[PDB]
PDB file of all heavy atoms in Angstrom:
ATOM      1  N   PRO C  34      39.218 -39.927  -1.122  1.00 50.16           N
ATOM      2  CA  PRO C  34      40.617 -39.942  -0.690  1.00 50.16           C
ATOM      3  C   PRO C  34      41.473 -40.796  -1.632  1.00 50.16           C
ATOM      4  O   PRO C  34      41.099 -41.916  -1.998  1.00 50.16           O
ATOM      5  CB  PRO C  34      40.557 -40.530   0.725  1.00 50.16           C
ATOM      6  CG  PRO C  34      39.069 -40.827   1.028  1.00 50.16           C
ATOM      7  CD  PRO C  34      38.263 -40.156  -0.021  1.00 50.16           C
ATOM      8  N   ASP C  49      28.019 -43.234  -6.795  1.00 41.13           N
ATOM      9  CA  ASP C  49      28.351 -41.878  -6.289  1.00 41.13           C
ATOM     10  C   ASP C  49      28.520 -40.880  -7.421  1.00 41.13           C
ATOM     11  O   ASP C  49      28.044 -39.740  -7.348  1.00 41.13           O
ATOM     12  CB  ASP C  49      29.656 -41.955  -5.525  1.00 41.13           C
ATOM     13  CG  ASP C  49      29.629 -43.016  -4.451  1.00 41.13           C
ATOM     14  OD1 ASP C  49      29.153 -42.738  -3.314  1.00 41.13           O
ATOM     15  OD2 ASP C  49      30.027 -44.158  -4.797  1.00 41.13           O
ATOM     16  N   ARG C  77       9.852 -40.831  -7.455  1.00 34.97           N
ATOM     17  CA  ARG C  77       8.895 -40.426  -8.465  1.00 34.97           C
ATOM     18  C   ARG C  77       8.004 -39.302  -7.972  1.00 34.97           C
ATOM     19  O   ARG C  77       7.401 -38.591  -8.775  1.00 34.97           O
ATOM     20  CB  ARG C  77       8.060 -41.639  -8.926  1.00 34.97           C
ATOM     21  CG  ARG C  77       7.202 -42.296  -7.835  1.00 34.97           C
ATOM     22  CD  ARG C  77       6.321 -43.402  -8.491  1.00 34.97           C
ATOM     23  NE  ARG C  77       5.434 -44.031  -7.520  1.00 34.97           N
ATOM     24  CZ  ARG C  77       4.447 -44.878  -7.815  1.00 34.97           C
ATOM     25  NH1 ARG C  77       4.226 -45.251  -9.066  1.00 34.97           N
ATOM     26  NH2 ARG C  77       3.673 -45.375  -6.857  1.00 34.97           N
ATOM     27  N   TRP C  78       7.848 -39.174  -6.660  1.00 34.34           N
ATOM     28  CA  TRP C  78       7.093 -38.073  -6.085  1.00 34.34           C
ATOM     29  C   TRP C  78       7.827 -36.725  -6.124  1.00 34.34           C
ATOM     30  O   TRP C  78       7.278 -35.765  -5.607  1.00 34.34           O
ATOM     31  CB  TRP C  78       6.591 -38.405  -4.659  1.00 34.34           C
ATOM     32  CG  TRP C  78       5.910 -39.747  -4.698  1.00 34.34           C
ATOM     33  CD1 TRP C  78       6.442 -40.971  -4.376  1.00 34.34           C
ATOM     34  CD2 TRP C  78       4.568 -39.996  -5.135  1.00 34.34           C
ATOM     35  NE1 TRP C  78       5.496 -41.960  -4.578  1.00 34.34           N
ATOM     36  CE2 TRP C  78       4.344 -41.382  -5.044  1.00 34.34           C
ATOM     37  CE3 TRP C  78       3.522 -39.174  -5.573  1.00 34.34           C
ATOM     38  CZ2 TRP C  78       3.123 -41.958  -5.412  1.00 34.34           C
ATOM     39  CZ3 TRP C  78       2.313 -39.741  -5.905  1.00 34.34           C
ATOM     40  CH2 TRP C  78       2.125 -41.126  -5.832  1.00 34.34           C
ATOM     41  N   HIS C  82      15.267 -38.819  -2.838  1.00 33.13           N
ATOM     42  CA  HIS C  82      14.973 -40.190  -2.395  1.00 33.13           C
ATOM     43  C   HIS C  82      15.597 -40.389  -0.998  1.00 33.13           C
ATOM     44  O   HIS C  82      16.704 -39.892  -0.725  1.00 33.13           O
ATOM     45  CB  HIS C  82      15.705 -41.120  -3.366  1.00 33.13           C
ATOM     46  CG  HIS C  82      15.216 -42.536  -3.461  1.00 33.13           C
ATOM     47  ND1 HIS C  82      15.415 -43.493  -2.484  1.00 33.13           N
ATOM     48  CD2 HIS C  82      14.692 -43.192  -4.531  1.00 33.13           C
ATOM     49  CE1 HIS C  82      14.938 -44.652  -2.912  1.00 33.13           C
ATOM     50  NE2 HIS C  82      14.512 -44.502  -4.156  1.00 33.13           N
ATOM     51  N   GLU C  96      34.451 -43.558   3.558  1.00 33.85           N
ATOM     52  CA  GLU C  96      35.658 -43.105   2.855  1.00 33.85           C
ATOM     53  C   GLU C  96      36.403 -42.223   3.893  1.00 33.85           C
ATOM     54  O   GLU C  96      37.627 -42.157   3.842  1.00 33.85           O
ATOM     55  CB  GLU C  96      35.341 -42.263   1.597  1.00 33.85           C
ATOM     56  CG  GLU C  96      34.862 -43.079   0.348  1.00 33.85           C
ATOM     57  CD  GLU C  96      35.962 -44.048  -0.111  1.00 33.85           C
ATOM     58  OE1 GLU C  96      37.102 -43.840   0.355  1.00 33.85           O
ATOM     59  OE2 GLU C  96      35.735 -45.011  -0.889  1.00 33.85           O
ATOM     60  N   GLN C 112      29.045 -51.200   8.667  1.00 25.41           N
ATOM     61  CA  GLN C 112      28.324 -52.334   9.245  1.00 25.41           C
ATOM     62  C   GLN C 112      26.891 -51.950   9.593  1.00 25.41           C
ATOM     63  O   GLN C 112      25.984 -52.764   9.498  1.00 25.41           O
ATOM     64  CB  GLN C 112      29.010 -53.019  10.436  1.00 25.41           C
ATOM     65  CG  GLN C 112      29.058 -52.200  11.732  1.00 25.41           C
ATOM     66  CD  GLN C 112      30.204 -52.592  12.643  1.00 25.41           C
ATOM     67  OE1 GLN C 112      30.773 -51.724  13.328  1.00 25.41           O
ATOM     68  NE2 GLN C 112      30.573 -53.872  12.639  1.00 25.41           N
ATOM     69  N   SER C 113      26.656 -50.685   9.915  1.00 24.94           N
ATOM     70  CA  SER C 113      25.288 -50.258  10.122  1.00 24.94           C
ATOM     71  C   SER C 113      25.113 -48.839   9.634  1.00 24.94           C
ATOM     72  O   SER C 113      26.018 -48.001   9.868  1.00 24.94           O
ATOM     73  CB  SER C 113      24.897 -50.401  11.611  1.00 24.94           C
ATOM     74  OG  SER C 113      23.653 -49.739  11.872  1.00 24.94           O
ATOM     75  N   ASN C 114      23.968 -48.585   8.995  1.00 22.79           N
ATOM     76  CA  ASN C 114      23.626 -47.204   8.613  1.00 22.79           C
ATOM     77  C   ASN C 114      22.208 -46.957   9.107  1.00 22.79           C
ATOM     78  O   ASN C 114      21.265 -47.567   8.568  1.00 22.79           O
ATOM     79  CB  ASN C 114      23.681 -47.023   7.086  1.00 22.79           C
ATOM     80  CG  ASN C 114      23.286 -45.625   6.563  1.00 22.79           C
ATOM     81  OD1 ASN C 114      22.542 -44.837   7.172  1.00 22.79           O
ATOM     82  ND2 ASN C 114      23.728 -45.361   5.321  1.00 22.79           N
ATOM     83  N   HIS C 115      22.061 -46.081  10.101  1.00 21.22           N
ATOM     84  CA  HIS C 115      20.701 -45.767  10.586  1.00 21.22           C
ATOM     85  C   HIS C 115      20.383 -44.346  10.233  1.00 21.22           C
ATOM     86  O   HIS C 115      20.999 -43.419  10.841  1.00 21.22           O
ATOM     87  CB  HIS C 115      20.555 -45.971  12.112  1.00 21.22           C
ATOM     88  CG  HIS C 115      19.198 -45.627  12.659  1.00 21.22           C
ATOM     89  ND1 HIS C 115      18.936 -45.545  14.011  1.00 21.22           N
ATOM     90  CD2 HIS C 115      18.038 -45.298  12.043  1.00 21.22           C
ATOM     91  CE1 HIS C 115      17.667 -45.213  14.202  1.00 21.22           C
ATOM     92  NE2 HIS C 115      17.109 -45.032  13.018  1.00 21.22           N
ATOM     93  N   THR C 116      19.507 -44.203   9.237  1.00 20.20           N
ATOM     94  CA  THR C 116      19.163 -42.863   8.779  1.00 20.20           C
ATOM     95  C   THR C 116      17.762 -42.509   9.266  1.00 20.20           C
ATOM     96  O   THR C 116      16.798 -43.270   9.095  1.00 20.20           O
ATOM     97  CB  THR C 116      19.393 -42.646   7.255  1.00 20.20           C
ATOM     98  OG1 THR C 116      20.776 -42.785   6.911  1.00 20.20           O
ATOM     99  CG2 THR C 116      18.912 -41.309   6.780  1.00 20.20           C
TER     100      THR C 116
ATOM    101  N   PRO D   7       3.665 -49.162  -7.609  1.00 16.08           N
ATOM    102  CA  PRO D   7       2.207 -49.259  -7.641  1.00 16.08           C
ATOM    103  C   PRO D   7       1.559 -48.085  -8.345  1.00 16.08           C
ATOM    104  O   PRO D   7       1.931 -46.935  -8.101  1.00 16.08           O
ATOM    105  CB  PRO D   7       1.799 -49.183  -6.171  1.00 16.08           C
ATOM    106  CG  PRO D   7       2.999 -48.729  -5.435  1.00 16.08           C
ATOM    107  CD  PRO D   7       4.207 -49.113  -6.244  1.00 16.08           C
ATOM    108  N   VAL D  15       7.908 -37.221 -11.244  1.00 13.31           N
ATOM    109  CA  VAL D  15       9.134 -37.584 -11.949  1.00 13.31           C
ATOM    110  C   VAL D  15       8.934 -38.961 -12.567  1.00 13.31           C
ATOM    111  O   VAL D  15       8.432 -39.885 -11.925  1.00 13.31           O
ATOM    112  CB  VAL D  15      10.414 -37.534 -11.081  1.00 13.31           C
ATOM    113  CG1 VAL D  15      11.673 -37.801 -11.897  1.00 13.31           C
ATOM    114  CG2 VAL D  15      10.572 -36.185 -10.376  1.00 13.31           C
ATOM    115  N   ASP D  22      15.632 -44.503  -8.572  1.00 10.79           N
ATOM    116  CA  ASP D  22      15.236 -45.905  -8.761  1.00 10.79           C
ATOM    117  C   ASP D  22      15.384 -46.393 -10.187  1.00 10.79           C
ATOM    118  O   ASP D  22      15.920 -47.487 -10.413  1.00 10.79           O
ATOM    119  CB  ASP D  22      13.814 -46.161  -8.284  1.00 10.79           C
ATOM    120  CG  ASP D  22      13.544 -45.529  -6.935  1.00 10.79           C
ATOM    121  OD1 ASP D  22      13.787 -46.153  -5.865  1.00 10.79           O
ATOM    122  OD2 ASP D  22      13.072 -44.369  -7.033  1.00 10.79           O
ATOM    123  N   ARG D  50      33.433 -47.388  -5.494  1.00  2.14           N
ATOM    124  CA  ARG D  50      34.664 -47.464  -6.269  1.00  2.14           C
ATOM    125  C   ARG D  50      35.497 -48.710  -6.025  1.00  2.14           C
ATOM    126  O   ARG D  50      36.371 -49.030  -6.838  1.00  2.14           O
ATOM    127  CB  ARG D  50      35.538 -46.233  -6.002  1.00  2.14           C
ATOM    128  CG  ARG D  50      36.112 -46.096  -4.594  1.00  2.14           C
ATOM    129  CD  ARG D  50      36.988 -44.820  -4.610  1.00  2.14           C
ATOM    130  NE  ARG D  50      37.499 -44.538  -3.274  1.00  2.14           N
ATOM    131  CZ  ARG D  50      38.537 -43.743  -2.992  1.00  2.14           C
ATOM    132  NH1 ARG D  50      39.227 -43.167  -3.967  1.00  2.14           N
ATOM    133  NH2 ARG D  50      38.929 -43.557  -1.738  1.00  2.14           N
ATOM    134  N   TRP D  51      35.256 -49.412  -4.917  1.00  2.00           N
ATOM    135  CA  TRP D  51      36.001 -50.621  -4.618  1.00  2.00           C
ATOM    136  C   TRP D  51      35.366 -51.852  -5.249  1.00  2.00           C
ATOM    137  O   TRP D  51      35.878 -52.943  -5.032  1.00  2.00           O
ATOM    138  CB  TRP D  51      36.070 -50.823  -3.110  1.00  2.00           C
ATOM    139  CG  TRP D  51      36.608 -49.558  -2.478  1.00  2.00           C
ATOM    140  CD1 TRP D  51      35.928 -48.559  -1.832  1.00  2.00           C
ATOM    141  CD2 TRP D  51      37.989 -49.199  -2.432  1.00  2.00           C
ATOM    142  NE1 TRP D  51      36.807 -47.586  -1.388  1.00  2.00           N
ATOM    143  CE2 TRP D  51      38.079 -47.967  -1.743  1.00  2.00           C
ATOM    144  CE3 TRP D  51      39.158 -49.822  -2.884  1.00  2.00           C
ATOM    145  CZ2 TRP D  51      39.300 -47.347  -1.504  1.00  2.00           C
ATOM    146  CZ3 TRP D  51      40.373 -49.180  -2.684  1.00  2.00           C
ATOM    147  CH2 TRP D  51      40.429 -47.967  -1.979  1.00  2.00           C
ATOM    148  N   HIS D  55      27.098 -50.708  -3.500  1.00 10.00           N
ATOM    149  CA  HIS D  55      27.234 -49.562  -2.568  1.00 10.00           C
ATOM    150  C   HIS D  55      26.310 -49.762  -1.366  1.00 10.00           C
ATOM    151  O   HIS D  55      25.119 -50.071  -1.520  1.00 10.00           O
ATOM    152  CB  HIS D  55      26.697 -48.343  -3.319  1.00 10.00           C
ATOM    153  CG  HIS D  55      27.099 -47.017  -2.745  1.00 10.00           C
ATOM    154  ND1 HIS D  55      26.603 -46.537  -1.549  1.00 10.00           N
ATOM    155  CD2 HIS D  55      27.932 -46.061  -3.224  1.00 10.00           C
ATOM    156  CE1 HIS D  55      27.116 -45.340  -1.317  1.00 10.00           C
ATOM    157  NE2 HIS D  55      27.908 -45.020  -2.327  1.00 10.00           N
ATOM    158  N   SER D  86      12.436 -43.671   9.307  1.00 32.65           N
ATOM    159  CA  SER D  86      13.749 -44.166   9.778  1.00 32.65           C
ATOM    160  C   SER D  86      14.068 -45.334   8.881  1.00 32.65           C
ATOM    161  O   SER D  86      13.132 -46.104   8.626  1.00 32.65           O
ATOM    162  CB  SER D  86      13.712 -44.625  11.238  1.00 32.65           C
ATOM    163  OG  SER D  86      14.878 -45.372  11.589  1.00 32.65           O
ATOM    164  N   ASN D  87      15.313 -45.407   8.412  1.00 34.12           N
ATOM    165  CA  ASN D  87      15.841 -46.556   7.696  1.00 34.12           C
ATOM    166  C   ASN D  87      17.147 -46.959   8.391  1.00 34.12           C
ATOM    167  O   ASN D  87      18.181 -46.229   8.446  1.00 34.12           O
ATOM    168  CB  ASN D  87      16.098 -46.147   6.219  1.00 34.12           C
ATOM    169  CG  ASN D  87      16.749 -47.246   5.372  1.00 34.12           C
ATOM    170  OD1 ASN D  87      17.374 -48.205   5.852  1.00 34.12           O
ATOM    171  ND2 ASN D  87      16.603 -47.088   4.060  1.00 34.12           N
ATOM    172  N   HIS D  88      17.087 -48.188   8.891  1.00 34.12           N
ATOM    173  CA  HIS D  88      18.201 -48.739   9.643  1.00 34.12           C
ATOM    174  C   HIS D  88      18.609 -49.998   8.923  1.00 34.12           C
ATOM    175  O   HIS D  88      17.894 -51.020   9.009  1.00 34.12           O
ATOM    176  CB  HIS D  88      17.888 -49.038  11.131  1.00 34.12           C
ATOM    177  CG  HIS D  88      19.063 -49.647  11.844  1.00 34.12           C
ATOM    178  ND1 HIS D  88      18.981 -50.234  13.088  1.00 34.12           N
ATOM    179  CD2 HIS D  88      20.358 -49.769  11.471  1.00 34.12           C
ATOM    180  CE1 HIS D  88      20.164 -50.708  13.441  1.00 34.12           C
ATOM    181  NE2 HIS D  88      21.016 -50.450  12.468  1.00 34.12           N
ATOM    182  N   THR D  89      19.723 -49.865   8.199  1.00 35.58           N
ATOM    183  CA  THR D  89      20.229 -50.982   7.386  1.00 35.58           C
ATOM    184  C   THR D  89      21.518 -51.459   8.016  1.00 35.58           C
ATOM    185  O   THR D  89      22.453 -50.700   8.376  1.00 35.58           O
ATOM    186  CB  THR D  89      20.437 -50.582   5.877  1.00 35.58           C
ATOM    187  OG1 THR D  89      19.167 -50.243   5.310  1.00 35.58           O
ATOM    188  CG2 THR D  89      20.994 -51.706   5.019  1.00 35.58           C
ATOM    189  N   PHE D  91      24.640 -54.413   7.567  1.00 39.77           N
ATOM    190  CA  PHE D  91      25.338 -55.056   6.430  1.00 39.77           C
ATOM    191  C   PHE D  91      26.072 -56.318   6.915  1.00 39.77           C
ATOM    192  O   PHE D  91      26.885 -56.226   7.817  1.00 39.77           O
ATOM    193  CB  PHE D  91      26.323 -54.071   5.752  1.00 39.77           C
ATOM    194  CG  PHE D  91      25.689 -52.755   5.339  1.00 39.77           C
ATOM    195  CD1 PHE D  91      25.857 -51.609   6.126  1.00 39.77           C
ATOM    196  CD2 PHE D  91      24.957 -52.636   4.174  1.00 39.77           C
ATOM    197  CE1 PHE D  91      25.268 -50.403   5.795  1.00 39.77           C
ATOM    198  CE2 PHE D  91      24.367 -51.419   3.802  1.00 39.77           C
ATOM    199  CZ  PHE D  91      24.558 -50.274   4.601  1.00 39.77           C
TER     200      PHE D  91
END
Side-chain angles (χ1 to χ4, degrees):
Chain C
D49 307 275
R77 62 174 183 171
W78 310 97
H82 201 287
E96 284 298 345
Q112 70 205 145
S113 168
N114 178 335
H115 178 190
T116 297
Chain D
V15 185
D22 315 272
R50 67 178 175 162
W51 307 101
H55 197 289
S86 167
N87 176 340
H88 178 193
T89 296
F91 307 101

